[PDB]
From Swiss-Prot, chain B:
SUPFAM superfamilies registered for this protein in UniProt: Thioredoxin-like
Organism: Mycobacterium tuberculosis (strain ATCC 25618 / H37Rv)
Organism taxonomic ancestry: Bacteria, Bacillati, Actinomycetota, Actinomycetes, Mycobacteriales
Protein name, as recorded: Thioredoxin-like reductase Rv2466c
InterPro entries: Rv2466c-like (IPR053977), Thioredoxin-like_sf (IPR036249)
One MF annotation (Gene Ontology) recorded for this entry: oxidoreductase activity
Length: 209, 210
């Protein structure tokens, strides 16, 4: 069947929305979904891209992606879906940028060993991380990046998560564009920020009471 | 029905490919197609990084668009489809940049009065051209721009004219993206120059000369 390969950094709000879209697509279309890790920190490693004043901030971004790579190595790519969902729910839906806590709680959420958190304070996963990152990002700029049946695109840039059959129609459309080698761009000007679907998280908080 | 509003300058190769695409769509889908004039010269005027020598060159790109606007004012928007087809066939499919020949012959092909060619040597139509241009281009960057069911996009950027059912599927896809107001971009690096339909050009040449 058709295949979506999707590269994510847990910190990226655009990856978050587009990945939730893919997951919606897989509920209404028969597709294979493979997640792969990429790194905003790698995109921002050079001072010509991110001034030194910000590096103390961006250095925190290595932790979650190192942990994701470590999790995938030990437990298989199958764990990336639940681990990413957990990290993204805390980062985007709950607004948590305390990434030590996000890592610890997300590993727990995904039923994984707590020891994986130690990957954040290691470079042992960085070669694997860089290989994964470049496989996704080189082929097309920034996030979000998807391959639709082996064809790499930047986007779709979505500011809200499409659901159900609407999500499925957007996938059908993407597959058509991917199937035409002489199509390169469809774009309109964006002036609105990402909007997350925070209702479930709010209901979860309420029901824990 | 679904509607394509398409803005074109006869000199633009990307407008040519995308407009030919839409005409292919119309063969395999029920669609309303409306053409409107825009101007590469106006695009260039409004840049702040264009050297003077190129501004002088762009000052020579007003002819075909002025004539198109004049033709529309006199005979209605309905004339833009046949007039543009005639101009573009010559400019792009035949590589003819003798714009006086192109304008004269294209007015004739479209059954329009020869005197419309005089619009090229006037500024009387320039405000109308600016209004038309901005209506198309501002709503979205440059060409090609299309409005799909009222929604303005840059693109689809196509380097080759899609034909047959493939043209139709690409339209279906565009309509779906247009229908979701929180979609903004799908892109890959352009690695192809514009490709015109050389077969069509040669068959036309054959049909009319042989
Ligand atoms: Mg009009």
């Amino acid at each position: 069947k058709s295949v979506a390969d999707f590269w994510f950094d847990p910190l990226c709000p655009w990856c978050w929305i587009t990945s939730r879209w893919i997951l919606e697509v897989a509920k209404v279309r028969d597709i294979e979904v493979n997640f792969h890790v990429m790194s905003l920190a790698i995109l921002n490693e050079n001072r010509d891209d991110l001034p030194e004043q910000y590096r103390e901030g961006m250095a925190r971004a290595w932790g979650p992606v190192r942990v994701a790579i470590a999790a995938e190595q030990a437990h298989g790519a199958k764990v990336l879906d639940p681990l990413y969902t957990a990290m993204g729910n805390r980062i985007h839906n709950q607004g948590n940028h305390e990434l030590d806590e996000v890592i610890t709680q997300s590993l727990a959420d995904a039923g994984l060993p707590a020891e994986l958190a130690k990957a954040a304070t290691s470079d042992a996963y960085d070669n694997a991380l860089r290989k994964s990152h470049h496989a996704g990002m080189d082929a097309v700029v920034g996030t979000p990046t998807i391959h639709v049946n082996g064809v790499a695109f930047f986007g779709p840039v979505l500011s809200k998560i499409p659901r159900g059959e609407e999500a499925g129609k957007l996938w059908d459309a993407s597959v058509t564009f991917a199937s035409y080698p002489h199509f390169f761009e469809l774009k309109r000007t964006r002036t609105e920020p990402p909007q997350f679907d925070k209702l479930a998280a709010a209901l979860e908080h309420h029901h824990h009471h």
